[PDB]
């Protein structure tokens, strides 16, 4: 078994804090000092990529693959996801990612980020929403959208659904709200990127009269980076979701070390709160470390060109993929386990409610117990 | 400008007749550039064989790919075309979301369905659906039910695997006094439902079935029609169109060994769209030649990229009259300015009850 295990890191725009977390988590692994916990050294090579440019993506990918990385940690968005996941699959290279989990059932992709679909439906059922607005963009896939629409027609809900991902003129957000008023809409499910939730909540405020008696369910694990203070001061109900428990001892010990870090070597550590994707980035290193300690323990002998059409041995990379998907470890995002398609399984999503009465953790959700209120 | 234009053909399960229509439409065009193609068959049950199919076609160096997707292979196939700038031309269901580099031969059906629910003043009905043609119709029904305060009882039936279970759903709907059905399912599944409607008895007279599927001519609705039920269907092929008759006349005369499904089954509308795709392709490449764009190979992961923009634009710019009527596309590759014919079959008889287009909406005769 090699002394050093090298991995790739594919980063994009606006993954600066995650890149620092990736660097800090790898460092933490390397320091120590425990023979059993650190039986090899973890190296990496990092490329930045412009997802808007396909050659930029395949280029970054081939660079890594052709250095002989044992795995690639990385990000994708809607433009690059298919290229990136399809090539990892064709080349049998394990891709570990905090990005939105793929709609398709795919191989060689370890998805650090848990599905939100189950938790949202359980909560809609809990609140008994049978009439509501659903504002959505498509940056995290079509899985929530399709489940909502099917639930709506099957359950006789009245869902007014509006796509808002292509909106650039913030005025348009205003008009849509006014249009929702004509249907006496008080309840909004917002399935959008954080940045876009922020823009919508700013318009609700600028517009006025859309806080008291309103309820906004924010379908995004990035709950902590959402700016909702002004909406909350107006009387609104807000529901959100998180997978990082600030009371968790592991989250705590990570945070204490993390906020001391220098802003030049680790940008975004001191000037912004820890994004949940930075926690998922940390936990990815735990998963990788654990997978590879396992392979080492089994005396596995870990074994081309960046080309699709020419072949690829069937059993290649299978050993690593399995080792990654069989891990059960406790991280900053709780219990971490994967199913055969690399999806988080047996995970917990914490549910938060903000009301004029105050702000609190209102329960938790898991696949077996569904929503448990507290 | 090359004399020979090469295209790929990506064929699936249950596209035999379309494959024969493809080969024949190309032959007709060839018998001034010449059309070559290479076929790959595809299994969509893996996100893997899909990537493999597209990559093989891509490495041959084709100028466009004619082919099919299903709900499973759709995102991966169309995404590859968009990323590698290779135009995909297809009779498959039009994509729910706006995509680039996908020319969709098949027009949206939702406008026509809504226009007709209004014409009939349906306010309470059953909505049976599978998701094999996307969510576009389902979403438009959801929206319209809210907008007009409809009382829609909706059941998903795509996953039903025992035909007996369809009788059970129909009975439940009887307890709700349902007489009006909107069926948004594959043709095969529609045939199964109508067979269960018949077997059940007493569900013809008094009932009205609106069949949301452009494969109207493949629906077996004779027994149901003899019982007194109302049926409404939709088509995009006019069998009285000279061009359709001329194609058919030569097509039924092909030997069954080389052209399977021409003699033992009526032309599917998807086979007509397949013929129309060759029309669109031939016209697009006449444009590019006229523009003096030169179109004269590597691996998926390695200029024919730079030309893709122009090919895609030529395709989407064409206007041609085909077996499916006027053919034009918008910036997202969706049919535009198309006509849908509406057929109703009553106890009084069967007839084209009018046509629907985006501007006039439904125009009864
Ligand atoms: C907001 O929460 C309150 C407190 O439970 C609830 O009773 C009310 O119905 C909610 N508002 C809306 C619009 O649902
Ligand atoms: C899920 O995780 C819990 C807590 O980590 C663990 O004890 C249990 O083994 C897991 N359950 C299943 C069903 O895998
Ligand atoms: C069927 O057809 C006639 C129109 O000729 C119509 O009035 C009747 O209401 C329709 N039947 C049903 C069940 O809706």
UniProtKB/Swiss-Prot annotation, chain A:
Residue ranges, Extracellular side: 1-374
Protein's cellular compartments: Cell membrane; Postsynaptic cell membrane; Postsynaptic density membrane
Disulfide cysteine pairs (residue numbers): 62-306
Glycosylation site residues: 34, 237, 346
Family: Belongs to the glutamate-gated ion channel (TC 1.A.10.1) family. GRIA3 subfamily.
Function: Ionotropic glutamate receptor that functions as a ligand-gated cation channel, gated by L-glutamate and glutamatergic agonists such as alpha-amino-3-hydroxy-5-methyl-4-isoxazolepropionic acid (AMPA), quisqualic acid, and kainic acid. L-glutamate acts as an excitatory neurotransmitter at many synapses in the central nervous system and plays an important role in fast excitatory synaptic transmission by inducing long-term potentiation.
Assembly, per entry: Homotetramer or heterotetramer of pore-forming glutamate receptor subunits. Tetramers may be formed by the dimerization of dimers. Interacts with PICK1, GRIP1 and GRIP2. Found in a complex with GRIA1, GRIA2, GRIA4, CNIH2, CNIH3, CACNG2, CACNG3, CACNG4, CACNG5, CACNG7 and CACNG8. Interacts with CACNG5. Found in a complex with GRIA1, GRIA2, GRIA4, DLG4, CACNG8 and CNIH2.
Extra facts: The postsynaptic actions of Glu are mediated by a variety of receptors that are named according to their selective agonists. This receptor binds AMPA (quisqualate) > glutamate > kainate.
This protein's name: Glutamate receptor 3
